[PDB]
């Protein structure tokens, strides 16, 4: 019916997104051919909470999503439908309906440049309590009222943009990991992606 799915360009990107601004590429009307995605390199995460990846090729869906971002090592475990953490409930949260995969991989082989990785940040400071999809794109200051700051020095407020310090001369646990998740949802609409039968 359609051509091959463009997933080949999702797992091979030239510049991924950040945590405060993450991609939300909607995929629909393609083929679910995971035969190539199954026999990939020995990555560190190939878990799919929804269903088995073998039977996924015979399951129809209306529209699927793809969200790619970059986190540290100790933050990979926080990606779960309901869990505490500095990123799990502050910057990247998922409701209790995720039926996709949490496939991720390390890419600390080509980023060996000791010059300051001040390009990626996760916005540790936030005031999100509900709405698990509460994103943030502006460059405001961390405040909660009560005569907020209006300067640059501060000393009572702070600039809510904490960049990473990824350096090649580090050990395990604090390494960069590119994580791509596939959000699935079904509404009152005919299905588009089913997979080769």
């Amino acid at each position: 019916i359609t051509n091959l799915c463009p997933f080949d360009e999702v797992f091979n990107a030239t510049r991924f997104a950040s945590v405060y601004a993450w991609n939300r590429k909607r995929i629909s009307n393609c083929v679910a051919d995971y035969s190539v995605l199954y026999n990939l390199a020995p990555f560190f995460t190939f878990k799919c909470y929804g269903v088995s990846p073998t039977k996924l090729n015979d399951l129809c869906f209306t529209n699927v999503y793809a969200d790619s971002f970059v986190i540290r090592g100790d933050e990979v475990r926080q990606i779960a439908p309901g869990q505490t953490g500095n990123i799990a409930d502050y910057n990247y949260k998922l409701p209790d309906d995720f039926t996709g995969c949490v496939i991720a991989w390390n890419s600390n082989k080509l980023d060996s440049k000791v010059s300051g990785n001040y390009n990626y940040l996760y916005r540790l400071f936030r005031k999100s309590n509900l709405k698990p999809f509460e994103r943030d794109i502006s460059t405001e200051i961390y405040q909660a009222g009560n005569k907020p700051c209006n300067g640059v020095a501060g000393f009572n407020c702070y600039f809510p943009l904490r960049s990473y310090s990824f350096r090649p001369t580090y050990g395990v646990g604090h390494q960069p990991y590119r994580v791509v998740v596939l959000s699935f949802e079904l509404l009152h609409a005919p299905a588009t992606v089913c997979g080769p039968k």
Partner: antibody
Amino acid sequence: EVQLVESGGGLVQPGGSLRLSCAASGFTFSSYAMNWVRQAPGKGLEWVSTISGSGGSTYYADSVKGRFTISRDNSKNTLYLQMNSLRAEDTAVYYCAKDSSSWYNYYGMDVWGQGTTVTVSS
Amino acid sequence: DIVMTQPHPVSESPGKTVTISCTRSSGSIASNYVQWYQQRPGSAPTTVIYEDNQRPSGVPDRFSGSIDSSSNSASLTISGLKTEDEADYYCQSYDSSNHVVFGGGTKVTVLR
């Protein structure tokens, strides 16, 4: 920096077929999502549909779902739009716009082009 | 989801700075960035910012963009009113379903 030429904007009776071509020029056209947008006379802009850069992912809006298709050619890059079973609300000026680089799909939009006026009368 | 409502067209005398507001229709502004476009009557729309907020493709300092969480709206500031500024403008963004949402439009008029 993007040339856009189509066939025409001749009217058609309700329940017809129309093919719009959005062949462009330049040098950077490998993988860029293309968005078909419309604007009704006396009304603001209205997004119609979109397609990914590689031509795999393609979807439409809610009111124009089921009777419109959009495809993309790469080696002779061109954005084809097939419109079937037109209604009285389809009379509008249509445009085909580019976007930013291949990483972000919902961030960045380059020059659009010219567009053409399609009318549906009886 | 819902088309973002855009206020009525405005007019301004030359030599001043104008501000256009764009309010979100439903939900919150906690989504992707909101951009603007300059469409002259009878001409094709032209973007005011190239990618996110930095130096666009030919507008040196006229157009600038900001986001206000207190009012939960986008603000387009246009300094140095010229004869080529009297035209229609639309604020466009994306929703949580990868749909391109536009605004109602606003005509900026220059007094002669």
